[PDB]
Design a protein around this ligand. Structure first.
Ligand SMILES: [Zn+2]
Ligand SMILES: [Zn+2]
Ligand SMILES: [Zn+2]
Length: 222
């Protein structure tokens, strides 16, 4: 058992040490994946510190409890959505056509145009922005509330799709040297292919020079 993936109840607080949460960055108004680092004493007397999963460089940070909630885990299907619902959506404020960040929003328009076409417009809570068109209609997340089952890293990483690919367009059919194996460009075998942490590019076990016997950081760095 990893120490990073074991929940600790220090005897108080509504989130457990090492619990997976989302943390609202007050500067942007968006929610980012994080974990509880510590729960200590000085909604008032309990202090929570976190680390952001994808910003370990930012270190340990104090966070008010109103800016924390259990990690988002459930994607709401189209038929589970209603006008007036408050859900978490991906939106880019500066470039509405592109992938952005994860914002709480109230659904104001729900329109099924055809079998494939849909119109989802929301009110984004930053101040608020009205009549925002959400492109990623298949990634609408339910907002979890205090008391939800505590997740740990043992359950999984529970990372959302947080990056913008220009090459293959995210299509699983087309080969890609950019977002898959650099040597051959084959997405086949997600299991027999290791990633890097610093630069983040992949290689198969048999595509490296020299080839590895069994299944990490890349060799071209060192
Ligand atoms: Zn690609
Ligand atoms: Zn390869
Ligand atoms: Zn690397």
């Amino acid at each position: 058992t990893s120490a990073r993936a074991r929940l600790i109840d220090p005897g108080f607080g509504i989130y457990k040490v090492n619990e997976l949460v989302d943390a609202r960055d007050v500067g942007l108004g968006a929610w980012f994946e994080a974990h509880i680092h510590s729960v200590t004493r000085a909604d008032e007397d309990v202090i929570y510190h976190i680390q952001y999963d994808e910003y370990p460089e930012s270190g340990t940070l104090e966070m008010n409890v109103k800016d924390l909630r259990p990690r988002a885990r459930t994607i709401l299907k189209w038929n589970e959505l209603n006008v007036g619902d408050v859900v978490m959506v991906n939106y880019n404020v500066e470039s509405p056509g592109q992938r952005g960040f994860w914002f709480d929003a109230e659904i104001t328009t729900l329109k099924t145009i055809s079998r494939t076409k849909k119109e989802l417009r929301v009110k984004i809570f930053l101040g608020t922005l009205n009549d925002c068109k959400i492109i990623s209609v298949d990634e609408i997340f339910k907002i979890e509330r205090p008391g939800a089952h505590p997740l740990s890293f043992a359950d999984g990483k529970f990372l959302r799709r947080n990056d913008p690919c220009d090459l293959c367009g995210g299509d699983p059919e087309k080969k890609c040297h950019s977002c898959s194996c650099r040597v051959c460009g084959g997405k086949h075998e997600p299991n027999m292919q290791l990633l890097c942490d610093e630069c983040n590019v992949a290689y198969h076990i048999y595509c490296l020079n020299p080839p590895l016997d069994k299944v990490w950081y890349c060799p071209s760095c060192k």
